[PDB]
Design a protein around this ligand. Structure first.
Ligand SMILES: *[C@@H]1O[C@H](CO)[C@@H](O[C@@H]2O[C@H](CO)[C@@H](O)[C@H](O)[C@H]2NC(C)=O)[C@H](O)[C@H]1NC(C)=O
Ligand SMILES: *[C@@H]1O[C@H](CO)[C@@H](O[C@@H]2O[C@H](CO)[C@@H](O)[C@H](O)[C@H]2NC(C)=O)[C@H](O)[C@H]1NC(C)=O
Ligand SMILES: *[C@@H]1O[C@H](CO)[C@@H](O[C@@H]2O[C@H](CO)[C@@H](O)[C@H](O)[C@H]2NC(C)=O)[C@H](O)[C@H]1NC(C)=O
Ligand SMILES: *[C@@H]1O[C@H](CO)[C@@H](O[C@@H]2O[C@H](CO)[C@@H](O)[C@H](O)[C@H]2NC(C)=O)[C@H](O)[C@H]1NC(C)=O
Ligand SMILES: *[C@@H]1O[C@H](CO)[C@@H](O)[C@H](O)[C@H]1NC(C)=O
Ligand SMILES: *[C@@H]1O[C@H](CO)[C@@H](O)[C@H](O)[C@H]1NC(C)=O
Ligand SMILES: *[C@@H]1O[C@H](CO)[C@@H](O)[C@H](O)[C@H]1NC(C)=O
Lengths: 228, 316, 73
């Protein structure tokens, strides 16, 4: 317990320091603001353009030219500005669709990886998922995925089954491992060897069908008690 | 089979509309900044095109490889493993896929940019994923790869779907024979039928049609005297040549806008498909899935990826 | 210092027979970087560190220790 608590606290401190020092981690949030501001500024700057007319300001045209062709010039100006507005609206629509697509995935992640524990591999972070915590951010959400990663390995010899009295014994859950001379049954994600016994294995037919089965004695907890 | 990326292309604006004309460039300058947003959008599309493949395939820290001696309890992976005999390190099924797909030449201001990753690196990525899956099982998706005999990995998979391992351990020969026969059958089916890769040919055909129509738009009068800019300039006087050129400018700009919008929509759809493919690769390949009909009909055991022109192919 | 790639022609950087992880993408599997000379190098992709698990038909590798990692999305 204490080791896991210390690891978790150290990880929290590390992510806090990483966020505090480096400022380039929030690209996925700054990009939206930059795109929106750039589009708005382009739309605003599109106002001052002749589009083929004499002047970019209609006030000069109306105060300097007769109506019969000032109307043609004004019409050209309206056509240009209307086309610009149409383009801006279309770009906004597409960007909003993309943001909705992102928001749906964000909602799914919040529903699954936060309100419960997910068994989807590589969906709530690398490794085996333990939990998640949410945090707010300007126009976005930030997830902290607490996961689980194995560290130090070993080498062992194995066997699919075991003969004890002509029968074949398979592990209830885990694997058979050997440290060179003895045999043990252990779980598949954390080395903890235990003595093989009938409480860890189950029988299935004779043992001349399995391939690569090596025979060793299987302890029985009933006989020592029954002797006395 | 599902697509993952489209052709990386980019079209210049000024050269396209009325390239090789100072007068028309001066006229177009009046239209504001219409000539830059299109280039920005196309560059964004190209960047996203590279990002799709980079995200889908690059999911391994290292590059694993199979041991030289192939002893997998009777399972035979020769049809999907990379073949050193071939000059390109691609398996037999990858070669079939590459040869089953057929088919930049115009230079009116449009160009195609090569992908960041050549097909050889994609093949190497798929080989690394396949070797990791075969040897380490699924534990290489979390931390360091841990070796495990293939028969025991299959026993773990059988225990995943609610069937005791003694079912597999007593039917190893039959299961191996069925798997080998299935691999042979799918190879033959891919090699025989011709319409097995529509989902990839359609994208190429659509992009080619769009580009061809965009180029063909050049030869439209759009209400002016003629579509030849040089003839209009050299036959009429500037006072009317200006108004004549204005119509061609407007029409060509409209065509370019329509093409750009179509490209944006198609790119969004392709991005959705690529995200789906990335999820499937991260779940069906790097592990066992309990979601029904997500990684194939029936109960799921494992998956093997392969590359294909602008796409990925799964074997469930 | 002229170099001819598949994606055009690059001048100002020298070719290198080595291979590293990409810092600036160029194309066709070619990237560039600023090593340390103090020049700009242009090289080929490096997908990752080579590895080969010592797979054997009766060998296993069981972890004996874990670590908790917190990742930000
Ligand atoms: C394999 O494991 C067994 C079980 O622990 C080891 O046998 C014991 O070893 C300890 C010392 O490590 C002795 O104190 C015990 O008396 C041994 N008990 C038995 C029943 O042998 C064995 O030494 C290990 N083998 C190797 C090569 O490490
Ligand atoms: C399991 O133990 C038995 C003996 O208890 C071994 O069976 C012997 O095998 C040899 C060679 O195959 C035969 O000549 C003997 O007749 C067998 N004896 C019996 C009683 O069956 C068997 O070899 C052991 N398992 C392994 C994998 O060696
Ligand atoms: C795996 O299957 C392939 C079939 O694609 C086997 O290769 C063939 O093997 C047969 C006899 O086993 C030969 O007659 C053919 O000429 C082989 N063809 C090719 C293209 O190699 C391969 O032998 C099988 N694997 C093992 C270990 O036998
Ligand atoms: C499992 O790994 C952890 C760290 O990854 C080990 O904890 C360290 O133990 C050493 C003593 O050998 C201490 O000096 C360190 O301070 C510990 N780390 C932390 C973060 O407290 C732990 O000992 C390992 N377990 C085993 C059985 O070796
Ligand atoms: C297990 O053995 C293989 C070959 O003997 C070796 O390459 C590997 O490093 C060993 N594993 C460990 C954790 O030492
Ligand atoms: C593993 O392969 C070797 C060949 O190098 C073979 O002798 C041995 O019998 C195999 N193991 C089993 C359990 O069959
Ligand atoms: C190493 O690079 C030099 C040029 O930098 C080149 O001439 C030489 O052929 C390269 N080495 C090999 C083995 O190709």
């Amino acid at each position: 317990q204490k080791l896991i608590a210390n690891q978790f606290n150290s990880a929290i401190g590390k992510i806090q320091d990483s966020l505090s020092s480096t400022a380039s981690a929030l690209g996925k949030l700054q990009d939206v603001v930059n795109q929106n501001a750039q589009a708005l500024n382009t739309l605003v700057k599109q106002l001052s353009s002749n589009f083929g007319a004499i002047s970019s300001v209609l006030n000069d045209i109306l105060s300097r030219l007769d109506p019969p062709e000032a109307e043609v010039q004004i019409d050209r100006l309206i056509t240009g500005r209307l086309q610009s507005l149409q383009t801006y609206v279309t770009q906004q629509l597409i960007r909003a669709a993309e943001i909705r697509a992102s928001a749906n995935l964000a909602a799914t992640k919040m529903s699954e990886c936060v309100l419960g524990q997910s068994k989807r591999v590589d969906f709530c972070g690398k490794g085996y998922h333990l939990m998640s915590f949410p945090q707010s951010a300007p126009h976005g959400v930030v997830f902290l995925h607490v996961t689980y990663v194995p560290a130090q390995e070993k080498n062992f010899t194995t066997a699919p089954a075991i003969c004890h009295d002509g029968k074949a014994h398979f592990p209830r859950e885990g694997v058979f491992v050997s440290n060179g001379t003895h045999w043990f049954v252990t779980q598949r994600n954390f080395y903890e060897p235990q003595i093989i016994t009938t409480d860890n294995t189950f029988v299935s037919g004779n043992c001349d069908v399995v391939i690569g089965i090596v025979n060793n004695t299987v302890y029985d907890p009933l006989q020592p008690e029954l002797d006395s | 089979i599902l697509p993952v990326s489209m052709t990386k292309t980019s079209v210049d604006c000024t050269m396209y509309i009325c390239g090789d004309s100072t007068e028309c460039s001066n006229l177009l300058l009046q239209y504001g900044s219409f000539c830059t947003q299109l280039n920005r959008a196309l560059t964004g599309i190209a960047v996203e095109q590279d990002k799709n493949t980079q995200e889908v395939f690059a999911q391994v820290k290292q590059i694993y490889k199979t041991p030289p001696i192939k002893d997998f309890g009777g399972f035979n992976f020769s049809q999907i493993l990379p073949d050193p005999s071939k000059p390109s390190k691609r398996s037999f099924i990858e070669d079939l896929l590459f040869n089953k797909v057929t088919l930049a030449q115009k230079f009116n201001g449009l160009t195609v940019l090569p992908p960041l990753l050549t097909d050889e690196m994609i093949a190497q990525y798929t080989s690394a994923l396949l070797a990791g899956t075969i040897t380490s099982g699924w534990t290489f998706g979390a931390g360091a790869a841990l070796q495990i005999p293939f028969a025991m990995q299959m026993a773990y998979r059988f225990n995943g779907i609610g069937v005791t391992q003694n079912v597999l351990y007593e039917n190893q020969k039959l299961i191996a024979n069925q798997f080998n026969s299935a691999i042979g059958k799918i190879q033959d089916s891919l090699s025989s039928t011709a319409s097995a890769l529509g989902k990839l040919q359609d994208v190429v055909n659509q992009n080619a049609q769009a580009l061809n129509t965009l180029v063909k738009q050049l030869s439209s009068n759009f209400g002016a005297i003629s579509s030849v800019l040089n003839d209009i300039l050299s036959r009429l006087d500037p006072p009317e040549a200006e108004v004549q050129i204005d119509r061609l400018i407007t029409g060509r700009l409209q065509s370019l806008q329509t093409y750009v919008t179509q490209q944006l929509i198609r790119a969004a759809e392709i991005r959705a498909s690529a995200n789906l493919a990335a999820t499937k690769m991260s779940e069906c390949v790097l592990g066992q899935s309990k979601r029904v009909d997500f990684c194939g009909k029936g109960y799921h055991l494992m998956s093997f990826p392969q590359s294909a022109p602008h796409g990925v192919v799964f074997l469930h | 210092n002229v170099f001819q790639t598949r994606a055009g022609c690059l001048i100002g950087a020298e070719h290198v027979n080595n291979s590293y992880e990409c810092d600036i993408p160029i194309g066709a599997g070619i990237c560039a970087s600023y090593q340390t000379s103090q020049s700009i190098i242009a090289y080929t992709m490096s997908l990752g560190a080579e590895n080969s698990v010592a797979y054997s038909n009766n060998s296993i590798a069981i972890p004996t220790n874990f670590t908790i990692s917190v990742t930000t999305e």
